[PDB]
Design a protein around this ligand. Structure first.
Ligand code: MG
Ligand code: MG
Ligand code: MG
Ligand code: MG
Ligand code: MG
Lengths: 237, 235, 198, 250, 204, 233, 243, 196, 222
């Protein structure tokens, strides 16, 4: 961890990335007034209760987080993000800006790459929301590296997901609505699942949109979800 | 600080090993005084002799040590020993008996030997002191924290050869002047250098206040060592 | 209140200490020994606040006894009194000070001289031919300024003490129930068991 | 968060060596030469400013440092270790001495404090020794002028003259040949310059050399007048021009 | 009541021609009761002299602390502490206990063994240095002492004369103070020798 | 690849694996089988107790956490004690501070977070126990599975421990039937005892062998052992 | 490999390998930067590479506003970069609060180098794989460039360059100051000092730049600021009408 | 002390007298009571001068750190930092602060933080010993969306009355004008405002 | 105590009387109340005498260390910020009231500090029991753009007002002049208007006047 290789690399972090790649695929899409988050939930057995192992997490009221890799490591990161968002709001009264929040997580993840008594996190996290000046979407690697994204994907289906995302950025340079971005997220998760077709899966979507949710993080449920599932089932065939 | 399968303390043994390369230091106890002599580690013409003290240190007005090992390790311990002597003075309004000071220092070394994962102090001491309970006393302590009392003793390089020579010529009814001679002869015989000259020595006595009823520590200036080196017939 | 007297003659130090323990309107005891032996040739008497008195004495007794066994040696009376003074000096600025005054009488075997030290609860030490703590000194200091000689025998000193106790029995408002008298000399510490009717 | 090396990193080897101290001394050996010469009425400490880039500005990096108004230091070895040692040395002069006795420490005692700071890096858990040797030159009322060397182990020695770093053996030889007890300060400066030329590859001028003295009081450097018993620092860094002046009649 | 009044006592120091004098009474009391006729209030560390008045337990404690500190000084420095330096050491030692001070009034007397200049100083309980060059006074009769000294003093007195002056200042100040007196000791300090004289005085 | 990478929980393997965690997972498989399942009205724990000797007690596998919550254990038993005590405290804190029964889901999250911290701290080991958690809260019956990796999942039914793969397949097969055993405690328990049977190379399940627990709509969490289980054998 | 490769203890040769390995980390981003001093300004130019077209180009930056007056450019992986940025900001705000004046460029640099020295000496800390270049117009020293590395070394520069192709740029500049004989760019406007920096980066690296290929920070008397794509475009056009 | 902040059409104006007293002695007759914690966020201090300087110095530190990391702070954020310090330390502070600021979004804003550390957003605020005498005058004469000149007049007239009656107030009237245009310092001498 | 600070066109002057007291009693007839924080930043204090000296020496020590660390001349605003923060922490229990004046690379500066930790800025200031007497003079004669000469005169006159009218002040006037380009000039006993008159009689005693009980030589050596 605190150990540089002879050519400046950190093998432990590179190994942590492998745990991420081994993970279920998750994505985020930035629309013209918000952000959408989707994730692939592997159905190991019929015994798993449908809708009841929620992966996507809220931080404060305006932020969604999704991750691939070691699920517990992600929860650990979200706990910290919640303490970090509360601390900001307590002192500054305003809810934490998305970039502000990004760095909070970043610095925390980076700290776990400084010391021999600690391991890096075994997750990549896709997160974001709406603040004072618009939508923001971020992705954060085990090294603590993070940037803003137009669209992002991580986990096993990452390469095909990135390909689909890249197409959308080309076909819609003029923004792209929250309602479309939800549909398209369901699509991309379905296409990314192609790899794992041996086991069945469940789809989870959340969104935070200025006009559709009033800038609050909200889970996509009911008819809106079914409509997005129907669109993905249609466009896969 | 761990034991070997043999029941030995590696780090202590290796510290003792390091000390056997340091300049020899000799202490001799006579009926009317104590002698401390030590060989400086091979130096240069450009070393300031007048302001140099690598081997002989004053603990209080009645107690001194000769050092063998790391000087920087020794200064650490000397400083605490000085403080300890003043604490005793403050508490009891009497000068610290020599053994009490020696025991404490030896206990500090023992500690490093038993807990904390720090390396031992690479230091052996010869203590030369006077108090009104045992009169003149001579003690020795090494990195293990063990300590022993002696009529004559050496530490550092060639202790085995120096010890045999002292065993040969030492006698209980000696005066300080006889002990001064014995210490310098023994160093001359055990040196690893051409000649035992003044510039390669530190020398000190604990007598009877020149003429008083009190106790006096004389730490010899370079010139005085040169004089006393001719007197004893080594020029 | 509690009576604590000391006198140093030529070859011994004599301590006298009242026997009463009084709480409220009741004398609970009339045979109290306000003394701890610290070492074979050093004795300490004490007076002050109800609990602190014995606690401090016994604490001091434990410390000197520890020293004796560690060194296989007996500290001089001057050393024990300096140790005691320092303990009190620390105490006075601690959270709850020991409210104890003490007399230390010792025979120094190295000098062959008796020694009396008076130390109050603040850690005020002084070496004296005779001493007292509390109200008792308001009578005995002047009496002894008159009657005392530096070359008196142990028996002469016991008379000088009898005189002091007679005056306190005459003029002091409280009944202190006589004193226990102890002599400290080259042979150590002994109690005179006859003083109340000697 | 938390240290997993709460044990000494300098330990004795079977032969008695303290490896990390030996290896630190090796780092000092690769360092640029520095030296000190003591005269009757002054001390000179000198060294070469080996610059990392010609785009760098070598005046922004001093190797010769004031510790107290009467004490200066120079080093060979790892510069950054020196920089932080100077900070701690300045501070300890105040906290352990000036805030107590209302005057600056004498040279030997400050050296003693620095030595302690270096000794601790030799015994404490989780640290390596300092990779430097210092030369410390000073004056004080009761000991006159003095010169000390301090090593990674915490050892210090008083010197009439010495050198450390790269060409130290040859320079110590050149100094034994040239030193005597009647040297005036200007003579010692002259020898310092000569001794340094053998150790210096490139250009040899007041911009590439760094030199300072412990001389007499500079009342012009005090900053105030009116207190007669305050006479000014004895530490003085020589200017580029002052150096070049002495290199003409070299 | 006042901790600086419980015990009683006075110390005065004066400078003369190539000399200094320091004096003190011998009283130790407990309010109205006089306890000890032998309580000396001047001590010395090397050629540096220190008088202390005030609470006697603190007088004793500060003596032991300054013996401690000057002994350590001498070992590390390889010389005796000088009067100017010691003065600073007393000041910082007192100020260290700013919010729990020793109840004392210390006085420093001595001759700088290098310059030969006579030196005196006073301090308040928290270490504020009184840097006067003529006389320093302290204790329960300090008012009486200031009066005597301001009247009696003149500069550059010979040691034999300075002795009379400092003694007369002490005695008469002591005799207007119920808590001072009971004997007195006077030190005449020359760069080479130091004479100590016990004075004869009223014993009431 | 497995060589120098399993010395502590603070090192990743070149595959990105945590071997200490995987080894802790292996102590669960060494444990005696226990089954959990639920309908809409009740949740049942069934556990095969194990004796050291024929002279010995059979060790308990079921621990009560609150009136509406309890768990069964498979793996290191002292680790179950540590984790159940924590869970009892979290249940307690919720009642005292908020006058609120702890959601079974939140119990899951709290256990997960606790396990996680031990998969990332030098000097500590991971927990070496699996737990099955049943409860009845404001949203009805619940079953959870806890792995000491920190993964907790909500299930209609499951089994952990040696030979548990049988019982699991059974439950997977019987899903549609047992989920609907509403208002009938005895039938649900029967289906649980039925399920644990598919995990026996052991033998017949006796009165000393068997441990059952139930919680539900109008039943506090209750443990059955000994003579009180005979009517299910 | 022994312990002397994994933590910051000395090797038998008196070297610290973890420090040397940290220097190699600085180049992992494959970005080059240069700083030059104007008459009354200081300019940092750095390359801007945005490989992934899923990235928001506006969030990709290695230039930081440390305080009102101090800018910092980092050569090294971003996580370490942002650690250094955060600390420097915190150090800058604290200095001002405690001492009542703005922290000088050189003093922040010394402070950051001191922190780096610590990671060089203490076993439990790894060094940061970054090189920090600090710029400002100091109220006392004028335009300033100070650069710190993983060894805890720092110094002032007339101009400087950092990155994989550091040398090519360095020698280019070394050659310029040979010609000019002065230690800054004799030019009034910061706009012309920015043009000089972009120009000499182009020659040294033999590469043309679009407005999205570069990143610019400027320090003047009492402000440090970064240029937008458009401000840079205006600079690119300006150079191209002659060069 | 007489201190006030008033919102108007183009921003916000802060005003104060310049008198600090210890007892009946005027320790300083030309105090600057208008304190900058950011470019366009200022405050007026009342109560213990030690306390309010210590607080303002800390807020200034927080807002500088805030700006380095997250950009320009809103007036609400400044007010919230002040409140945090005042509330959490109510047992050892005697501090009444009025916060005033301008940003492009929220225009001119005023918050008052009285003794106990509560926060109140107001169109205008008055405070200090001298304020008590002008509650009537200010409530009758203040209107929303006044011009710069009208607002400067309102503060001038208000504080001259507060100065007229309160012995602890007086000296010169200082003002800071806060708008999109920038920051403007104003001063008014007794010979002008006494004749009002 | 009377202390003053007076700005002029090219710098700043500070002055103080030289009387220290213990209640009604004068202990030192000629003490120094002008303390150095650094070579060109000087300080005058009133209140608890040990406190003003100590807080001055502490902050002076740290300012020296700062200066060395930063390679810059110490600034007056740094002395002010460190003093006020230190004093504030102790809530007035360190009874230091100070006038702090100096020059630095940014110009010249005049400040007052109070024991609870508040500070102020001005062109003329007084502190101490003599402050009102001094301020009356300052309010009478101070003008903008004083020459160095006039500023010394004004400050000296202000101190004199305290000397003659305040019982807490007396004896001599000390001045320190700090001009922007120059070394600070400390002018000890710049005025001495209170020389004690020759006494009417000499009080030197005939030798032997004092009765001596016993005598002995004291050993200094070892
Ligand atoms: Mg990814
Ligand atoms: Mg008095
Ligand atoms: Mg009297
Ligand atoms: Mg390190
Ligand atoms: Mg008014």
């Amino acid at each position: 961890n605190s150990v540089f290789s002879p050519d400046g690399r950190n093998f432990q972090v590179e190994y942590a990335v492998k745990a991420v790649e081994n993970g279920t695929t998750s994505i985020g899409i930035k629309c013209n007034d918000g952000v959408v988050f989707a994730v692939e939930k592997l159905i190991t057995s019929k015994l798993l209760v449908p809708q009841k192992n929620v992966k996507i997490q809220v931080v404060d009221r305006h932020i969604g987080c999704v991750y691939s890799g070691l699920i517990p490591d992600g929860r650990h990161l979200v706990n910290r993000g919640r303490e970090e968002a509360a601390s900001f709001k307590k002192l500054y009264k305003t809810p934490i800006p998305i970039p502000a929040f990004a760095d909070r997580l970043g610095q925390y993840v980076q700290a776990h790459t400084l010391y021999n008594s600690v391991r890096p996190f075994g997750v990549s996290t896709i997160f974001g929301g709406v603040d004072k000046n618009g939508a923001h979407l971020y992705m954060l690697e085990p090294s603590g590296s993070y940037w803003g994204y137009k669209g992002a994907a991580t986990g096993k289906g990452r390469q095909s997901a990135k390909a689909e995302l890249e197409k959308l950025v080309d076909h819609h340079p003029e923004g792209l609505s929250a309602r479309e971005a939800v549909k398209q997220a369901a699509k991309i998760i379905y296409l990314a699942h192609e790899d794992n077709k041996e086991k069945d899966f469940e789809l989870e979507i959340s969104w935070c949109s200025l006009s559709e949710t009033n800038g609050l993080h909200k889970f996509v449920k009911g008819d809106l979800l079914q409509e997005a599932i129907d669109f993905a089932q249609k466009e896969i065939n | 600080t761990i034991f070997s399968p043999e029941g030995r303390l590696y780090q202590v043994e290796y510290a003792l090993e390091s000390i056997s390369h340091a300049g020899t230091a000799i202490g001799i106890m006579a009926s009317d005084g104590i002698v401390l002599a030590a060989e400086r580690k091979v130096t240069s013409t450009l070393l300031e002799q007048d302001t140099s003290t690598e081997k002989l240190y004053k603990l209080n007005d009645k107690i001194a040590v000769a050092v063998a090992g790391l000087t920087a390790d020794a200064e650490i311990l000397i400083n605490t020993a000085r403080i300890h002597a003043q604490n005793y003075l403050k508490t009891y309004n009497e000068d610290i008996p020599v053994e009490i000071l020696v025991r404490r220092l030896s206990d500090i070394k023992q500690g490093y030997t038993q807990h904390g994962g720090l390396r031992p102090f690479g230091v052996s001491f010869i203590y030369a002191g006077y108090d009104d309970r045992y009169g003149y006393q001579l003690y020795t302590s090494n990195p293990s924290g063990n300590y022993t009392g002696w009529k004559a003793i050496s530490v550092g390089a060639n202790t085995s050869a120096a010890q045999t020579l002292l065993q040969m010529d030492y006698k209980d009814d000696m005066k300080v002047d006889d002990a001064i001679e014995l210490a310098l002869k023994t160093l001359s015989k055990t040196t690893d250098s051409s000649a035992l000259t003044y510039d390669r020595l530190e020398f000190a006595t604990i007598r009877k206040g020149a003429n008083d009823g009190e106790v006096y520590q004389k730490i010899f200036k370079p010139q005085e060592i040169k004089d006393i080196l001719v007197k004893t017939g080594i020029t | 209140m509690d009576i604590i007297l000391g006198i140093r003659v030529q070859d011994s130090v004599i301590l006298a200490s009242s026997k009463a323990v009084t709480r409220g309107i009741s004398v609970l005891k009339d045979s109290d020994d306000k003394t701890r032996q610290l070492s074979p040739h050093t004795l300490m008497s004490f007076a002050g606040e109800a609990g602190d008195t014995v606690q401090f004495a016994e604490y001091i007794q434990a410390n000197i006894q520890l020293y004796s066994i560690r060194e296989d040696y007996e500290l001089s009376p001057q050393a024990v009194s300096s140790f005691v003074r320092q303990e009190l000096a620390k105490s006075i600025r601690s959270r709850r000070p020991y409210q104890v005054n003490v007399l230390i009488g010792g025979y120094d075997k190295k000098k062959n001289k008796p020694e009396l030290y008076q130390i109050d609860y603040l850690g005020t030490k002084v070496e004296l031919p005779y001493g007292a703590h509390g109200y008792s000194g308001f009578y005995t200091f002047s009496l002894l300024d008159h009657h005392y000689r530096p070359d008196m025998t142990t028996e002469e000193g016991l008379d000088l003490l009898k005189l002091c106790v007679q005056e306190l029995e005459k003029r002091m408002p409280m009944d202190f129930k006589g004193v226990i008298v102890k002599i400290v000399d080259k042979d150590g510490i002994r109690q005179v068991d006859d003083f109340q009717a000697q | 968060m938390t240290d997993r090396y709460s044990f000494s990193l300098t330990t004795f080897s079977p032969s008695g060596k303290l490896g990390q101290i030996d290896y630190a001394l090796t780092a000092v050996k690769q360092g640029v030469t520095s030296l000190g010469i003591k005269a009757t009425n002054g001390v000179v400490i000198a060294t070469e400013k080996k610059s990392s880039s010609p785009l760098a500005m070598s005046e922004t990096l001093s190797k010769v440092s004031l510790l107290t108004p009467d004490i200066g230091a120079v080093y060979s070895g790892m510069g950054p270790d020196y920089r932080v040692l100077v900070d701690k040395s300045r501070k300890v002069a105040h906290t352990s001495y000036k805030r107590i006795y209302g005057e600056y420490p004498p040279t030997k005692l400050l050296v003693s404090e620095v030595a302690k700071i270096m000794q601790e890096a030799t015994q404490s858990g989780g640290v390596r020794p300092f990779g430097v040797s210092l030369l410390i030159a000073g004056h004080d009322e009761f000991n006159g002028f003095s010169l000390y060397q301090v090593d990674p182990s915490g050892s210090y020695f008083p010197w009439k003259a010495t050198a450390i770093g790269k060409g130290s053996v040859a320079a110590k030889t050149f100094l034994e040949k040239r030193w005597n007890d009647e040297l005036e300060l200007e003579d010692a400066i002259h020898i310092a310059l000569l001794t340094l030329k053998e150790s210096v590859e490139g250009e040899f001028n007041g911009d590439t050399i760094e030199l300072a003295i412990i001389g007499d009081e500079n009342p012009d450097l005090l900053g105030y007048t009116g207190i007669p018993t305050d006479k000014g620092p004895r530490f003085r860094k020589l200017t580029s021009q002052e150096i070049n002046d002495r290199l003409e009649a070299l | 009541s006042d901790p600086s009044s419980i015990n009683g006592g006075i110390v005065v120091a004066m400078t003369g021609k190539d000399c200094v004098a320091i004096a003190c009474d011998l009283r130790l009391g407990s309010q109205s009761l006089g306890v000890s006729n032998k309580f000396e209030k001047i001590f010395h560390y090397g050629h540096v002299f220190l008088g202390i008045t005030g609470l006697a337990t603190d007088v004793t404690t500060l003596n032991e602390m300054f013996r401690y500190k000057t002994n350590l000084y001498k070992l590390k420095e390889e010389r005796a502490i000088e009067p100017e330096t010691f003065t600073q050491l007393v000041s910082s030692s007192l100020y260290e206990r700013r919010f729990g001070p020793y109840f004392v009034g210390p006085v420093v007397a001595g001759i700088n063994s290098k310059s030969g200049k006579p030196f005196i100083a006073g301090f308040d309980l928290i270490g504020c240095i009184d840097e006067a060059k003529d006389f320093i006074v302290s204790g329960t009769a300090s008012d009486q002492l200031f009066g005597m000294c301001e009247s009696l003093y003149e500069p550059n007195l010979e040691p034999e004369d300075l002795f009379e002056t400092i003694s007369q200042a002490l005695l008469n100040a002591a005799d207007r103070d119920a808590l001072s007196g009971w004997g007195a000791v006077v030190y005449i300090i020359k760069k080479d020798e130091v004479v100590k004289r016990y004075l004869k005085m009223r014993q009431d | 690849f497995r060589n120098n990478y399993d010395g502590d929980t603070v090192t990743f393997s070149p595959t990105g694996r945590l071997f200490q965690v995987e080894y802790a997972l292996e102590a669960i498989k060494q444990g005696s089988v226990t089954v959990g399942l639920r309908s809409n009205t009740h949740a049942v724990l069934v556990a095969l107790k194990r004796n050291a000797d024929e002279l010995s007690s059979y060790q308990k596998k079921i621990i009560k956490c609150d009136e509406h919550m309890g768990l069964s254990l498979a793996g290191l038993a002292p680790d179950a004690r540590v984790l159940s005590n924590y869970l009892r405290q979290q249940c307690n804190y919720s009642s005292l501070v908020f006058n609120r029964k702890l959601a079974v889901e939140r119990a899951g999250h709290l256990l997960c977070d606790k396990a996680q911290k031990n998969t990332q701290s030098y000097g500590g080991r991971p927990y070496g126990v699996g737990l099955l958690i049943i409860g009845y809260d404001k949203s009805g019956a619940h079953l959870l599975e806890f792995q000491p990796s920190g993964n907790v999942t909500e299930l209609y039914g499951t089994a952990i421990g040696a030979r548990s793969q049988g019982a699991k397949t059974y439950l997977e097969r019987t899903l549609d039937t047992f989920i609907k055993i509403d208002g009938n405690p005895d039938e649900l328990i029967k289906a649980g005892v039925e399920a644990i049977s598919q995990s026996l190379r052991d033998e017949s399940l006796t009165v000393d062998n068997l441990s059952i627990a139930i919680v539900g709509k109008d039943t506090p969490f209750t443990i059955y052992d000994g003579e009180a289980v005979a009517k299910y054998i | 490999a022994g312990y002397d490769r994994h933590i910051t203890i000395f090797s038998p040769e008196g070297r610290l390998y973890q420090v040397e390995y940290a220097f190699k980390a600085t180049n992992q981003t494959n970005i080059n930067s240069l700083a030059v001093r104007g008459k009354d300004c200081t300019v940092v130019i750095s390359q801007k590479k945005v490989p992934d077209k899923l990235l928001d180009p506006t969030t990709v930056s290695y230039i930081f506003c440390i305080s009102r007056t101090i800018g910092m450019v980092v050569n090294g992986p971003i996580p370490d970069a942002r650690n250094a940025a955060l600390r420097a900001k915190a150090e800058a705000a604290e200095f001002r609060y405690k001492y009542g004046y703005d922290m000088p460029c050189d003093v922040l640099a010394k402070r950051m180098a001191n922190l780096s020295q610590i990671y060089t000496q203490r076993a439990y800390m790894r060094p940061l794989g970054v090189i920090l270049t600090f710029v400002s117009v100091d109220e006392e020293l004028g335009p300033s460039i100070y650069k710190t590395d993983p060894a805890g070394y720092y110094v002032g520069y007339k101009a400087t360059a950092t990155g994989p192709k550091q040398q090519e740029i360095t020698t280019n500049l070394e050659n310029h100051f040979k010609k000019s004989k002065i230690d800054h760019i004799n030019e009034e406007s910061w706009e012309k000092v920015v043009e000089f920096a972009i120009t000499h980066m182009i020659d040294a690296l033999g590469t043309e730049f679009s407005k999205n290929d570069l990143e610019v920070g400027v320090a003047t008397k009492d402000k440090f600021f970064t240029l937008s794509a458009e401000n840079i475009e205006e600079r690119l056009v300006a150079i191209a009408e002659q060069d | 002390t007489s201190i006030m902040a008033v919102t108007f059409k183009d921003g916000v104006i802060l005003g104060a007298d310049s008198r600090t007293t210890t007892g009946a002695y005027i320790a300083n007759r030309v105090t600057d009571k208008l304190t900058r914690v950011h470019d366009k966020i200022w405050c007026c201090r009342s109560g213990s001068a030690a306390d309010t300087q210590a607080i303002a110095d800390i807020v200034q530190y927080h807002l500088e750190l805030y700006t380095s990391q997250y950009g320009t702070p809103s007036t609400e954020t400044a007010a919230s930092v002040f409140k945090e310090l005042c509330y959490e330390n109510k047992d050892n502070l005697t501090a009444g602060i009025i916060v005033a600021g301008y940003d492009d979004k929220n225009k001119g804003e005023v918050y008052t933080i009285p003794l106990g550390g509560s926060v109140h957003k107001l169109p205008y605020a008055i405070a200090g010993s001298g304020s008590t005498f002008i509650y009537g005058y200010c409530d009758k004469n203040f209107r929303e969306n006044m011009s710069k000149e009208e607002t400067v007049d309102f503060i001038k007239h208000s504080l001259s009355q507060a100065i007229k009656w309160d012995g602890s107030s007086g000296g010169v009237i200082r003002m800071v004008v806060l708008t999109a245009a920038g920051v403007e310092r104003l001063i008014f001498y007794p010979d002008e405002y006494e004749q009002l | 105590t009377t202390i003053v600070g007076v700005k002029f066109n090219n710098g700043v002057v500070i002055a103080a009387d030289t009387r220290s007291t213990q209640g009604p009693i004068v202990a030192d007839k000629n003490c120094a109340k002008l303390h150095r924080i650094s070579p060109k930043i000087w300080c005058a204090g009133a209140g608890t005498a040990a406190d003003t000296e100590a807080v001055t020496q502490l902050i002076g020590s740290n300012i020296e260390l700062h200066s060395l660390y930063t390679s810059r001349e110490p600034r007056v605003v740094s002395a002010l910020q460190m003093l006020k923060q230190h004093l504030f922490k102790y809530q007035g229990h360190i009874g230091a009231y100070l006038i702090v004046a100096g020059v630095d690379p940014t110009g010249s500066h005049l400040f007052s500090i109070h024991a609870h930790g508040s500070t102020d800025v001005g062109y003329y200031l007084s502190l101490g029991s003599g402050s009102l007497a001094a301020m009356a003079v300052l309010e009478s004669h101070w003008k903008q753009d004083l020459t160095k000469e006039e500023a010394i005169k004004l400050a000296s006159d202000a101190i004199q007002a305290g000397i003659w009218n305040d019982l807490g002040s007396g004896s001599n006037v000390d001045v320190c002049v700090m001009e922007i380009g120059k070394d600070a000039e400390y002018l000890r006993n710049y005025l001495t208007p209170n020389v004690r008159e020759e006494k009417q009689k000499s009080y030197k005693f005939p030798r032997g006047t004092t009765a001596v009980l016993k005598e002995s030589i004291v050993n200094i050596c070892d």
